[PDB]
Amino acid sequence: KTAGRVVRITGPVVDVEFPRGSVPELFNALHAEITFGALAKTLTLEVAQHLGDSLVRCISMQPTDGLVRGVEVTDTGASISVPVGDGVKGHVFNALGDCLDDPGYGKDFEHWSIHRKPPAFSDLEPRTEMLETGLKVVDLLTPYVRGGKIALFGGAGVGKTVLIQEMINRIARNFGGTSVFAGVGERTREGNDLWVELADANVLKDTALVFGQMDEPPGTRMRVALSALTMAEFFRDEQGQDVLLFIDNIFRFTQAGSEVSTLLGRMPSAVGYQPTLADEMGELQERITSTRGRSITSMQAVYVPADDYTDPAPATTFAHLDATTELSRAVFSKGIFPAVDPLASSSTILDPAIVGDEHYRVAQEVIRILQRYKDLQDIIAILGIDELSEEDKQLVNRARRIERFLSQNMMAAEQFTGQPGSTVPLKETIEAFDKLTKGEFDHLPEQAFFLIGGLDDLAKKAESLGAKL
């Protein structure tokens, strides 16, 4: 027979021996059986390496607990494939493409292999078009790109997922195209909450959800992103639809890859990561892109281990993005939401040629004031503003008001604070921050600028606090 047998099992990695001439090709899906009662299941293994002597090293998509050496392994002759089509919208899937909410659904759909090459370089078209969100900090300092790639970096508990939900609320609700959400190595209860919320907001019918969460073997965690990306790619290429691809969290894909690489016997790279870290990142990320005339607006949450932005994973992630919002623990501690680091976040379309001269000038003045404020933090931490000159004192007051004003009562933050969110038009944001930089609100209290929308809210809160605008 042309079937193999398990020879070694080391965690979620299995070595399978095949008769000569029947060795499966790399990335082929194989099936094995676990028979023990509680854990009885059909393991899907992905061929990862050819070891020689007709042995292949494979990554299991399910826990290999209960697997026995010598069990038969069958080669399906093809890589993992997931259902595609408009039918996937409104449903929840796992990495292998099984439907969770309606088991057995989609078996008759067209199936696409989750492995494919990125678009040809000649088909790539740079995208420079501002996607307005209504968030003052995002719109002003790190404008998002429609059809571009956006990332939200941040440590643990700084508001990455809340910001992803905020952008789903602001961008996806009033969206005519398709949305694909990829939960990668994140809380299962978060996935359930997102599913319920999307159903409540009547956005689920236009959304496809693919969840591979924390309680999964590393193989599933490092292939679920590919599954969701394949669904998005079908929507982009085979239907000419505008696509929103939400991923949370991509660092989990990288970390699962690191665990898999450790299992596979590769020599570790710096900080214990897999040697092929940048390469796996690159293939996955360059599959996420807008080709000429076909738009994918992807937004990805990137976890930063131990608040270490120097860690190889986010460091290699940075290069694949058009807009980068770096959330800061320091900003989070001050209660400022979203906890954006204005001096660390960036956008490729924040230049005068694209956003105009007024937007650019106001943003650059805000950044200059905040940078000068950060430079003084050493003196202020010891002596306070009292030792600074008059010019520095004025700039410090202006910068504190600016940093308060960059905060905003978010739409998704209502569940926490109970206060409804607000949207700020881009022109109003530019004008308000222009006035702030000039110094037309230097007399109001700082708290008047905390967690509000435009200038009307600023005036109302100043009145409540006893000041006048």
Next chain:
Amino acid sequence: TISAADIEGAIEDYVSSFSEEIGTVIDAGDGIAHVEGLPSV
């Protein structure tokens, strides 16, 4: 001259004729043991 059919019967007979598991500790150290045998584990 090749039988092309006796091969299957012969291999089946050999495996059948060849057919509690008890393993043996081959080495032990620092909370890790290695056990030879137990092919059905």
Next chain:
Amino acid sequence: RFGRVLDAEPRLSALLSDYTTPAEGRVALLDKALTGRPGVNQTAAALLSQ
């Protein structure tokens, strides 16, 4: 010819290739399966068996 037929049936070659199993059992297998047949040279039979 024996090498050709062994290559044709990789499963049989792999089964014979497990030094863990007793030598006598595999020798008997080969004798009563391939080596021992009417149209087999005695010298080749003994050489392959050893």
